Structure formats: structure tokens, C-alpha cells
Amino acid sequence: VHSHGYKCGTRHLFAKKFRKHGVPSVSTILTNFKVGDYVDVVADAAVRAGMPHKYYHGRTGIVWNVTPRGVGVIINKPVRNRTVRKRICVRFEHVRKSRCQEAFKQKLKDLEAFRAAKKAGTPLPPKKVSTRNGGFVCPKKVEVLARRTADYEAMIPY
Amino acid sequence: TFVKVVKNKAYYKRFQVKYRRRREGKTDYHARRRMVLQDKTKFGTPKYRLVVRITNRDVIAQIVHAKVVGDEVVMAAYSHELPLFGIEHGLTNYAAAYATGLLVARRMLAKLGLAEKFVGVKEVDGSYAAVRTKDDDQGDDESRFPFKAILDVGLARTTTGARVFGVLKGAVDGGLAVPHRPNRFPGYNKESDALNAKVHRDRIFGRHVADYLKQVREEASSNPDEKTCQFSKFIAAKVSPDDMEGMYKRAHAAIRADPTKRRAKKERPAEAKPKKYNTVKLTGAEKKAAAKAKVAAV
Amino acid sequence: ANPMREIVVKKLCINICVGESGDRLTRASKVLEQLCEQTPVLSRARLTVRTFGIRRNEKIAVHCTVRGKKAEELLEKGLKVKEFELKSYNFSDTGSFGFGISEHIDLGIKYDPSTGIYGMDFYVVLGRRGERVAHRKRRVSRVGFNHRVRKEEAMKWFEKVHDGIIFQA
RNA sequence: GGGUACGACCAUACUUGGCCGAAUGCACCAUAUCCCGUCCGAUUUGUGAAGUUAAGCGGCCACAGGCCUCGUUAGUACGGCGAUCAGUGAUGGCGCUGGAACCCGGGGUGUUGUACUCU
RNA sequence: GGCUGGGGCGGCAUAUCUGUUACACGACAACGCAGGUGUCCUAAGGCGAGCUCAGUGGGAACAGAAAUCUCACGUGGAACACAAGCGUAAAUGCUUGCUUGAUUAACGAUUUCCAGUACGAAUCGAGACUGCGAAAGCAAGGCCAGCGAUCCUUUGCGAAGAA
RNA sequence: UUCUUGUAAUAUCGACCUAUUCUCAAACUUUAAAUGUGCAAACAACCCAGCCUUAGUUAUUUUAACAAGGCUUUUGGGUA
Numbered sequence: 001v002h003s004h005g006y007k008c009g010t011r012h013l014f015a016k017k018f019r020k021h022g023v024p025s026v027s028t029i030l031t032n033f034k035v036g037d038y039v040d041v042v043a044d045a046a047v048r049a050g051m052p053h054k055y056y057h058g059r060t061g062i063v064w065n066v067t068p069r070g071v072g073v074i075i076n077k078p079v080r081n082r083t084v085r086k087r088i089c090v091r092f093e094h095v096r097k098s099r100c101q102e103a104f105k106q107k108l109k110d111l112e113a114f115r116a117a118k119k120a121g122t123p124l125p126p127k128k129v130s131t132r133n134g135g136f137v138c139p140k141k142v143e144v145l146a147r148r149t150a151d152y153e154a155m156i157p158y
Numbered sequence: 159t160f161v162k163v164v165k166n167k168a169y170y171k172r173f174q175v176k177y178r179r180r181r182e183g184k185t186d187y188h189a190r191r192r193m194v195l196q197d198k199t200k201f202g203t204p205k206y207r208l209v210v211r212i213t214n215r216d217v218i219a220q221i222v223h224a225k226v227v228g229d230e231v232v233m234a235a236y237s238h239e240l241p242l243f244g245i246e247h248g249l250t251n252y253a254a255a256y257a258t259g260l261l262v263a264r265r266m267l268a269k270l271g272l273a274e275k276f277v278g279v280k281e282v283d284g285s286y287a288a289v290r291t292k293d294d295d296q297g298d299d300e301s302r303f304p305f306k307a308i309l310d311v312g313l314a315r316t317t318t319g320a321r322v323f324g325v326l327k328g329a330v331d332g333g334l335a336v337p338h339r340p341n342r343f344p345g346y347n348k349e350s351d352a353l354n355a356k357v358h359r360d361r362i363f364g365r366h367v368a369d370y371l372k373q374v375r376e377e378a379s380s381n382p383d384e385k386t387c388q389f390s391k392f393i394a395a396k397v398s399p400d401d402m403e404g405m406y407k408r409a410h411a412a413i414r415a416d417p418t419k420r421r422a423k424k425e426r427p428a429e430a431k432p433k434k435y436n437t438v439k440l441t442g443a444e445k446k447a448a449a450k451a452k453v454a455a456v
Numbered sequence: 457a458n459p460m461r462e463i464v465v466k467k468l469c470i471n472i473c474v475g476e477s478g479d480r481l482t483r484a485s486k487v488l489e490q491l492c493e494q495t496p497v498l499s500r501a502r503l504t505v506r507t508f509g510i511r512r513n514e515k516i517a518v519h520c521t522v523r524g525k526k527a528e529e530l531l532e533k534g535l536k537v538k539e540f541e542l543k544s545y546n547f548s549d550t551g552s553f554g555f556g557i558s559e560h561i562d563l564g565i566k567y568d569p570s571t572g573i574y575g576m577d578f579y580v581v582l583g584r585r586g587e588r589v590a591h592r593k594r595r596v597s598r599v600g601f602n603h604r605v606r607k608e609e610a611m612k613w614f615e616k617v618h619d620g621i622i623f624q625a
Numbered sequence: 626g627g628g629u630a631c632g633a634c635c636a637u638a639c640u641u642g643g644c645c646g647a648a649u650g651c652a653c654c655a656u657a658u659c660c661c662g663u664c665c666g667a668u669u670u671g672u673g674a675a676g677u678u679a680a681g682c683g684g685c686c687a688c689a690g691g692c693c694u695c696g697u698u699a700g701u702a703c704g705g706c707g708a709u710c711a712g713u714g715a716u717g718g719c720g721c722u723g724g725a726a727c728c729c730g731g732g733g734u735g736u737u738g739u740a741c742u743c744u
Numbered sequence: 745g746g747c748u749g750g751g752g753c754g755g756c757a758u759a760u761c762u763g764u765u766a767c768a769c770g771a772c773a774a775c776g777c778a779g780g781u782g783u784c785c786u787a788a789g790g791c792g793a794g795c796u797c798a799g800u801g802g803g804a805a806c807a808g809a810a811a812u813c814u815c816a817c818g819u820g821g822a823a824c825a826c827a828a829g830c831g832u833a834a835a836u837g838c839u840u841g842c843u844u845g846a847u848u849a850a851c852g853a854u855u856u857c858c859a860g861u862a863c864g865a866a867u868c869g870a871g872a873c874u875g876c877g878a879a880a881g882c883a884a885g886g887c888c889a890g891c892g893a894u895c896c897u898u899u900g901c902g903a904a905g906a907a
Numbered sequence: 908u909u910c911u912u913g914u915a916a917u918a919u920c921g922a923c924c925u926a927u928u929c930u931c932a933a934a935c936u937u938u939a940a941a942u943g944u945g946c947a948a949a950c951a952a953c954c955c956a957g958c959c960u961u962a963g964u965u966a967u968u969u970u971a972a973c974a975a976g977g978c979u980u981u982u983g984g985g986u987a
Contacts, residue, residue, distance in 0.1 A: 001773075003761050003780090006856045006866060007888045009829045011764080011934080016831060018937075019174050019636095021819095023835090026187070027634070029195045030226050032202050034974095038946070045831050048887040049867060053856050058769065060946035065853095066199045067869055072854080075945090078770085079860060089854045089868040092198065100947040109953070112987070116954095120986090159550075160801035160817040162924090165640060170691050171937075174819055175636050176833095183595045185632090186834050193880040201974050203964045205880085209631055209740095213651065215673055220631070220740070228632045231740035236630090250673060252660075275967080291966050301971035303964085308880055310631085312594065314793060316878050319661030319670045326878090335965085338878060344660065357660090361671095366659035370672060373658045388656055388674040428648080428744040432627030435647050437685035439734080449688040460654095461679045467667075471813035473806065495664035499812050508811055517812045523665055548803030550815045556805025575805040579814055586653045589681050591667060593834080595652095600680040601642085607802095 006053055016045050024093050031092075033071065037063045039097045041073065041090070050091030060098055071095060185312055193308055194224045206307035208329070208336065209234075210322060215250040219262045219325065221307070233266035235419075242420045243409045247392050252344060252361040253406060256324030260332025260410060265417035267305055267333035273298035276305055278331030280411055284345070284358035287330075288337035306335035318342045324362055332414055363406050368399030463605075463613050466583035468527035469554070470520050471499070472576040475508060477515035487560060487571045488518045492530075496520030519577075530563070534578050535618055537562040544611070544624045551605030554579035582610045 016022075024044055040060045043051055050070050055077060065072025070091035076083035118124055149156075163169065179185035196205035204223055209231070211218035220234035237249040240257055248254040267276060274296035278287075289306055309326065316322070323343045330336065340346060344361040345354030360366065375393050378384040472488050474481045477500065488496045501514035510516060522530065535542075537557055547553035558575035561567045584605060589597050614620025 001757085002765090003763085003828095003889085004857065005761065005829090005888050007830085009762075009888075011829095012768090012936085014830055021174060021832070022176075023187075023191065023832095025633095025635085026191050026194055027226055029191070030224075030633095031198070033198050040946075045887095046836095048831085051867080051887095053866090055770070055856095056945095058945055065868090067853095068197050068199050070868060072868080077860095079858090082860095084860070086856095087854065089866095091868080098946070100945090102947085104948045105953095108949075112953070116986075159815090162800065163818075166690065167692090169819095170636095170639075172819075172821085173636090173639075173691090175639065176819090177635055178638075179632085179635095180834080181636080181638070183593070183597070183834085185594075188834080189880075191880095192882085195880075197964095201964050203973080207631090207880090211630075213629090214653085216650095218630070218741095222631065222740080224632090225739075226633055228634095228738035228740090230738090231631060234630085234740060236741085251671080270967095270971095272967095289965055294967090299967060301967040301969070303972080304966050306965065309878070311878075313669085314878075315662085315669055316793095317661050317670055319659090320878095321660095321671085322878080336879075337965090341878080361660070364659095367672070368659090370658050374656095374672090374674090386675085388672075390674045392674075394674090422742065423744075426744060427626080427628090427742075429626030431744065432648065434626090435645085435684085436627085437645075440686065442732085446688075453688055457679095459679060460677050466815095467665080469804085469814055471804070473812055475806075475811065489664095492664080497664065497813095501811050503811080505811055507809095508807080510811060512811095514811075519813050521665060521667090521814090523667075546804070548801090548815060550802055552803065552815055554804025554814075556807095558805050577805050577807090577813060579804045581815065584680085586677075586680050588653060588667090593668085595682090597681065603680045 007048070007051075014043065014045065028093065033063070033066050033092075035063050035066055037097055038101050039063055039071075039073065039095050040100075041075075041095050043094055046093060047091070050089060051094055052088055052090065056088070060100060063095075069093075189312075190224075190310065193310065204303055207310045208307050208334070209310045210325065212250075212255075217249060217255050217258045217325070219258050219329075221262060221266045222310070233262050233269060235262045235265065235417075239420055240409070243413045244405055245409050247395060247397065248364060248367070251364055251367055252319075252321040252324045253364040253367065254324075255321035256328040256362045257406070257409060257413065259325035259327065259329030259334070261328070261413045261417045263329045263331070263333030264414055265333075265419065268298070268417060270302055270305070271298045271300055272296075272305070272333065275299040276330070276333050276335050277414065278333075280414060282327070282331070282359055282362055282410065284327060284343065284355035284362055285353060286338075286340040289335050304335070305333065306337075308336050316342050318344055318346055321361075323358075327362070328410075332417075363403050365399075365402065368402050371397070372399040460585055462585035463609060464583045464585065465527060465531070466581040466587075468522040468530055469552075469579035469581055470496075470522070470576065471517055471579065472519065472574050473517040474574070475510055475514075475516055481515045481518070483571055484574050485518050487565070487574060488520055488576075491560070491563065491565050492520045492522050492526070494520050494522065517577075531580065532618065533563050540614075540619055541621050542614070542623065544607075544622050547607045547610070549607040551583070551607060551610055552579065552581045553607075553610065582613065584609075 024046060038060055039062075040058075041052060041056045043057050045051075056075060059075055061073045061075035063071050063073050064087060067089075070089065072087050072089065073095060074085045074087040077086050078084075114125065114127070164172075175181065177187065180187070190207075193207060194205065196203065207222045207224040207229065209218075209220040209222050211220075217237040218234075219236060220231045222229050222231045224230075235258065237254060237258060239261070240246065240249065240254065243257070243261065245254055245257055264273070264277065267273070275298065277296055291304065309322075311322070320342065321344075326334075326336070326338065327343075340353065341348045341351075343353065343355075343358050345357035346352065371389055371392050374389050375385050470488065470492065472484050474484050481498070485496065485498070496518040497520060498515055499517040499519055501508075501510045501512055501516040504511040534555075534557065538555060542553070542555060546555050554577065556575065556577045559573050560571075560576060561573060567573075582605065584603055586603065587599070590599050611620055611622055615622075
């Protein structure tokens with residue numbers, strides 16, 4: 001059985017990788033928040049505080065909190081027969097807003113905007129096509145296949 | 159210099175690159191990063207960066223908000239506007255750094271109207287006042303963040319010569335409110351902590367200059383050289399060391415009294431004018447033919 | 457052409473190795489000191505060698521860096537000792553050169569037996585007009601090739617003034 | 626359009642070499658009384674005038690270097706799927722599903738905000 | 745005692761830390777592989793500023809390969825108290841400068857391991873009070889191992905006032 | 908060897924340089940799968956108003972901004 005640091009390491013994961021070294025950007029810091037955001041978790045390294053244990057990068061949870069430097073994310077962690085919500089104390093630097101949800105809503109409103117426009121706003125306005133289908137065809141030059149060995153002396157392994 | 163390394167693709171492979179103004183070596187982020195950073199928690203409150211700048215003997219001021227996709231300059235002015243306000247020779251010195259701060263401060267805060275909240279002394283002893291909110295005697299005021307902010311540097315030579323100190327002082331008094339630890343102004347001992355505002359004021363009132371514009375010439379005058387070699391404009395455009403305080407003093411007042419911006423030639427510059435001497439990226443298809451014909455040749 | 461494109465001495469770079477320290481080094485210090493009338497910089501050993509019979513952090517040399525008129529003078533003096541005759545081998549190609557001399561009095565320094573004498577190491581750096589780019593932080597930058605020196609410029613410079621003779625062929 | 630400047634983005638932005646640069650400006654560049662700071666005015670501090678675009682800087686150039694980027698490779702490889710089947714054993718094997726890296730080719734070679742300027 | 749390819753023995757796989765096994769989430773055994781821990785450190789803490797390596801060349805009395813000196817390179821290849829691993833370069837390094845935040849708390853809130861006990865160990869606020877700095881800011885002793893119930897002892901916990 | 912012998916030349920083969928080049932990794936590694944792994948997919952919603960409130964934002968509300976939440980008869984009002 002194995003050794004256990006709460007920050008017990010790995011091979012090639014935590015290490016800060018391919019030209020991706022160094023501090024978080026100021027863009028990172030310019031960000032802005034509100035709570036309830038569904039944001040995803042990543043690990044810089046940078047400061048080895050506010051830094052989750054292993055579970056958590058690549059997972060999406062929801063923020064419940066914004067503290068000075070940091071934000072609270074409750075995440076559902078799967079134990080036995082359940083997922084428990086865990087509320088984790090990160091400083092802001094280790095988390096980011098997805099698109100996961102964004103689209104859904106985005107579309108939903110956009111669509112509504114259109115659906116609404118379409119009735120009950122002014123205009124009227126084509127989008128898409130159906131799915132997939134049949135068709136007339138006037139092709140104009142079919143081929144076939146003849147494979148391997150003819151002129152194999154030109155090619156193949158030795 | 160010296161070499162035996164690959165410096166090619168494996169090298170490249172083995173190169174990281176650092177930020178643009180490190181490619182440039184224009185700006186060192188760490189502090190900007192740290193300066194810029196703002197408690198989110200405390201809102202999206204506007205954490206303003208004051209851009210603080212000197213070119214090779216030239217002063218530049220701006221009031222900024224730091225931002226993505228570029229930061230944003232709300233106000234700025236620099237040493238050649240001081241001519242509107244009559245300080246025209248002077249522009250490196252401690253005095254001229256200062257001046258610049260009072261103006262911009264004022265114009266910006268005139269931007270939110272404030273001719274007067276935060277519009278300070280006119281004395282310019284060269285002492286200290288921090289912040290806190292106080293009352294309401296000044297004016298031209300309103301609810302949008304009361305106007306304090308932070309200095310953007312990139313050179314910790316915070317000496318008792320450093321005329322960053324000057325600008326600040328004007329900056330602040332003319333409108334700004336970044337306070338500070340008053341510890342290395344001109345005439346200021348940290349050690350056994352002492353301020354001679356007076357001399358700092360003297361520095362703000364160029365008297366070191368006055369004297370150096372004394373010392374340099376009329377004395378040196380005995381001989382033709384030294385006298386023939388610096389401050390040329392200054393006594394070429396003839397002032398006398400003494401005159402000094404007035405112009406500043408009144409400038410200061412004029413500035414503070416109204417900052418309201420000077421023009422420029424102003425009709426549209428020329429765009430074709432610069433582009434007129436340029437080159438742009440060559441033509442490869444063609445280049446291949448050009449190179450190709452040559453290697454074909456010799 | 458050239459408009460102003462100079463060649464200048466950047467700075468004079470003396471070293472006095474004292475393979476040991478203490479008194480000989482302090483004693484040396486005074487010499488080197490007065491000579492340059494500066495605060496020379498002390499060099500110590502910086503590792504224990506044992507082959508040299510020296511250790512780490514000995515205080516094993518002073519050296520001093522000199523700028524200004526003084527240098528130019530000193531240059532000539534030392535060249536004087538050395539009567540303006542030098543090895544090509546004395547030169548880094550980096551656009552500098554050095555030579556060692558035993559004995560200091562001929563530099564022109566008034567003898568005293570107290571100090572006595574030392575054998576010292578002399579180093580000469582040369583520069584050009586307008587150099588500043590490679591030494592002022594913000595947007596410090598490497599040197600333009602058409603300002604990049606080499607050894608030649610200096611030998612030619614020497615021949616032109618101080619009237620270099622390069623030994624050799 | 627450039628410049629300037631603050632950028633933001635952070636390599637098509639990069640090493641390397643040429644060639645060239647109007648303006649504004651940058652720049653180099655002089656100085657060190659003051660302040661300032663340094664063995665050292667090199668840095669820095671302080672002053673800033675004479676020079677000088679040589680460098681920088683800029684822009685371009687380049688069977689340049691690098692990157693960038695696509696294609697190419699290759700449904701191979703490599704996975705997924707099977708009761709089944711051949712196989713000394715690995716395997717190999719089908720049809721059902723997915724799916725390369727390198728290579729070479731090809732092309733590409735910073736983007737663009739904010740404030741300022743410069744007809 | 746146990747442990748354990750029987751017991752014994754040896755070994756410690758018994759609290760443990762690391763890296764690796766281990767299937768590109770997560771989790772996974774062996775007396776598997778390769779390693780560690782019982783301390784260390786008033787700075788090796790903490791903060792600023794400054795400074796930049798590993799490494800290579802060229803020169804420079806003595807001095808030669810190896811002294812220093814010095815130019816000059818040089819994506820860290822170092823270096824960072826330490827095993828190991830992570831990170832990382834105008835710093836996190838490194839040097840200097842200054843310090844005591846290795847501080848004090850209603851100390852809630854928080855995580856990890858997980859029984860969703862625990863300790864241990866971590867994370868996030870708030871209050872102090874300091875430090876440091878130009879300033880944003882940082883600073884609750886590099887980050888991860890280096891550590892301890894009930895039970896017992898002991899050390900520390902208002903004087904001062906107004907009844 | 909020619910040269911004394913050469914910090915010689917010239918041969919000389921090595922060292923070294925360099926580009927070349929084979930063949931390779933559990934604790935190597937750019938890139939990088941497949942196969943997996945988080946989340947998200949609705950009304951307790953959207954908007955529009957205009958509200959309420961805040962010892963939220965070194966404060967200036969105020970016909971500030973934002974923040975923030977609370978509201979909101981017949982949605983208040985609209986809106987699937």
C-alpha cells in the first residue's frame with residue numbers, strides 16, 4: 001500500500017507544462033465574479049494554497065462564495081452511493097468560468113429572442129434546414145478500386 | 159560574445175518566451191500584476207492605475223484605469239503642455255515633474271466636475287496629507303468614486319532626489335489622492351525623520367536649478383568654456399535664477415485655476431505621410447522564382 | 457561613412473592577485489588604493505583550492521575599476537612601464553585586453569618598502585560611441601553589429617594612438 | 626498611417642544576417658552645481674544643454690534561422706466491438722466502432738484595444 | 745506481539761513520507777521497484793530593494809587545468825536546509841536591506857485522508873497587533889514527510905477601578 | 908618521415924569539434940490517442956418596469972455607478 005501527502009504528487013500532471021510555466025496573467029485577475037457561477041477548476045501551482053487536492057481539476061461546480069482573494073466552490077464528489085457537495089476554499093487564481101452552460105442558455109435566450117421576434121417582434125427570418133435526406137444525382141465520373149500489386153515493384157517494403 | 163549550442167529548433171524547443179513587455183523589456187509585470195489585482199469581493203470597484211512616466215528628459219502623465227484589451231487613459235498631459243501654463247524651459251527637474259501632476263489631476267477631476275474636491279493647498283510647502291474622507295468644503299464633486307488611485311512605476315529609485323515625489327505632490331494636491339508614506343521626498347530624512355518641505359518646495363521651485371543656472375554660467379563666465387556647454391537654452395532663453403518662484407507660483411495657480419486643455423495643429427495629421435517611407439512583407443511565389451533563378455545561375 | 461561613431465575606452469580594469477590574504481592583501485590594498493585613489497574592490501578566493509595552498513574566500517586580490525581621465529593616464533603609464541608594446545595574445549577579442557606586470561613603482565607610484573611591491577594584473581576595456589543600449593534596464597538591448605567591436609579595432613586604435621605594436625607577425 | 630504612449634493578448638510577436646528609414650517621437654547623447662547615488666554618474670540620482678542617428682529604435686529584407694499554420698501521413702498505427710475462428714505461442718484473424726505521433730508538402734509569419742501626437 | 749507464501753529467522757512491507765506500479769479521471773495488492781521520515785533551521789522566518797544561474801568562450805603578473813580579474817555568452821540545463829517529487833528565473837532563485845505574522849484571537853468557515861470518525865496535516869475569512877514597502881501589497885515560519893488519545897501532571901488565564 | 912625536434916612541416920592515426928548515423932526507456936519525453944473521466948442541457952425561468960434595503964465598494968448615493976439582494980395585487984408589467 002502507498003504513501004500519502006495531501007498534496008501527494010504525480011508524474012506529469014501537476015508540473016506546470018509546455019511553455020505554460022510561470023504566474024497567472026493579469027487577464028486572469030481582471031476577470032470579475034458573481035456567485036453561483038458554474039466555473040471549472042484547474043491548478044496553477046503558483047501558490048500552494050487555495051489549491052484543492054486531487055479530485056478537482058477537470059470538474060465543474062458552482063461557486064457559492066467570493067472572499068478576498070478567493071472563491072468558494074461546492075463540488076459534488078462521488079462517494080459510495082452518492083455525490084457529496086464539498087465546499088472548497090480556493091483563492092481565485094485556481095478557478096474559471098466554463099461555457100458548459102453558457103451555450104444552453106445562450107441559445108435559449110437567443111432563440112427565444114428569435115422565437116419572440118418571429119411572432120411578436122417585427123420580422124420573420126430563416127435559419128437552418130432540416131437534418132439529412134435523399135436526392136437526384138447527375139454524377140459524371142464514377143470510379144471503382146483495384147488495390148495492391150500492380151506496379152508493386154515500384155513500392156511496398158524491400 | 160560566446161557560443162557552441164544549437165540555437166535552432168531543438169533550442170527553440172528548449173526556449174520559452176516571456177511577455178511582450180518582457181520581450182520588450184518595457185515593463186516588469188510583478189508589481190503591475192500586484193498593483194492591478196483587486197479584491198473582486200470588493201466588487202469591480204475601479205482600481206485605477208496612475209501611469210507614471212519620464213522619456214529621456216521629458217515628463218508624461220496619465221490617469222488610467224487598468225483594463226483588458228488595453229487599459230484606459232482617462233486623463234493625461236505631459237511636459238509641453240506646461241507651456242500653456244508658462245513653464246517652458248523647465249521640464250526634467252523636480253519642479254517640472256511636479257507641476258505636471260497638479261494639472262492633470264485637476265483636469266481629470268474637473269472631468270468629474272471636481273474643480274475642487276481634492277484641489278489642495280496652493281502653498282506647496284511640500285508636506286504631507288494622507289486621505290480618509292473628510293467633509294465637503296471643496297466642490298464641483300459627485301458620486302463616482304472619490305478619486306484616489308495608485309502610481310505605475312517600474313523604477314524603485316525612491317531617493318531624496320526622485321522627482322516622482324514631485325509629481326505626486328502636485329498630483330495629489332491638484333486633485334489626486336494616492337497617499338503615501340512621506341519618506342524620501344527632497345529634504346525629507348527618513349532618518350530621524352525629518353521633512354524640509356521648504357527645500358522640497360525649493361526643489362519644486364527649482365532653486366537648485368536657479369543656482370545651477372547661476373553657477374553654470376555667469377561665474378564660469380570667467381572662462382569661455384565651461385560656460386559654453388550646458389543649459390544652453392536656459393540662459394540662451396535667458397531667465398535669472400531669482401525670477402523663478404513667480405513663474406512657478408503663478409503657473410501653479412493658473413493650472414489649478416483651470417486646466418482646460420490646449421489644442422494641437424489639428425485638422426487630421428497625415429497617414430500616407432508616414433507610410434511613405436516603409437516596406438512590408440515581400441512576395442514568396444515570386445521570391446521563390448527570384449531565389450530560384452539566382453541559385454540556378456550563380 | 458561615419459558621423460560620429462567613435463571608439464572610446466570604456467574603463468580600466470586592474471587586479472592585484474595576492475595568493476593568500478591578510479596583511480599582504482591589506483598592504484596591497486593600500487597600494488592599489490592609493491593608486492587609483494578609489495575603493496578598489498576586493499576579490500577573495502572563492503573556493504578552496506589547496507593546489508594553490510589557498511582556500512575559499514581568502515582575500516586574494518584587489519582589483520579596482522576606473523573611469524575617467526585618470527584611466528587614460530593610467531593606461532599610458534602602464535603602457536609606459538610596458539612601453540607601448542603588446543601581445544596579440546594579451547587581447548580578448550571581446551574588444552579588450554590585459555597584461556600583467558610584475559612590480560608597481562614604475563606605474564609612477566612613489567615607492568615605499570612597506571608596501572614594497574606586488575606583481576599585478578592589468579586589464580584594459582575598450583568601447584565605442586553611444587553604447588548605452590546595453591545597460592539601462594527598460595528596453596536594455598544587445599549591441600548593434602555596427603557598433604559591435606572586436607579586437608582589431610583596438611589594435612588599430614592602439615597603433616593610432618599609443619602607438620601599438622602587436623608583437624607577432 | 627505613423628509616431629507616441631498605456632496596453633491587452635503573449636512567439637505568425639522568436640534567434641540570425643543584410644538593406645533602408647520622413648514626421649512627430651523615441652533614441653543615442655553631454656553634464657553633474659543642486660539633489661541623488663554610486664569604487665565608479667556604468668547604473669541610478671540630479672541637471673540637460675552640445676552632438677548624433679552610428680547604434681538603438683523602426684520597417685523591410687533574407688533557396689536566413691525559428692515559429693506559425695494547414696495539407697500530408699495513416700484508418701495504417703492504434704483503440705473499441707465479438708461466443709466466433711485459426712493459431713506452439715504470441716499472435717493473427719473477420720465483420721460492428723473509434724482513431725494516431727513523426728514525416729513530407731503547402732502556405733503562413735504578430736493581433737489588436739485605450740489615451741496622445743504627427744497633415 | 746504481530747508481521748510472515750509454515751513456524752522460526754530474517755526482514756518491517758506495523759505510524760509514515762516520496763516516486764514509480766496502476767490501465768491518459770478517480771480509486772487499486774505484493775516481505776513489488778526505487779527512495780525518504782523521527783530532525784533541520786532567528787532565519788534557512790518574514791518583508792522590500794537590489795541582484796541573476798547551471799553552464800560555455802575570450803582575455804588579463806604571479807596563476808599553470810584549477811586563485812582572482814575581467815569581458816563575453818548562457819531559458820535554469822541551476823539553485824532553492826534536507827528524501828523524493830512538484831514548481832519556478834527582472835523570481836520562488838540569489839544578494840543585500842529592514843524586521844518579527846514562527847505573533848495573537850470570538851477564532852467560526854473551509855479541505856484532505858475518510859467511518860464521509862479521527863487525528864494529523866492543509867485551506868479561507870474576520871479581529872488584533874506588528875513588519876515591511878512607494879505603493880499595490882505581502883507577511884499567520886517553501887509546498888508537499890518530519891509526528892501523538894483517554895488518562896494523569898504541569899505551565900499560562902485580571903490587577904486596576906466603579907458596589 | 909623530412910626535419911634536432913619543434914607551440915614543426917609533412918605524412919600519420921587517433922583524441923577532440925561537427926553534421927551525419929544505428930539501435931532504444933517502468934520510474935524519458937514533445938505531440939498524443941482509442942477506451943474512459945467533470946459539467947451543462949429549463950419555470951423556483953426570461954425580460955420590462957419600478958420598487959425596497961444595506962454601519963456592500965479609504966465615499967461622493969441620489970435624480971452616481973456599480974455592487975448586492977429584497978421586492979413587485981390582476982406577473983406589477985411583459986414573456987414560453
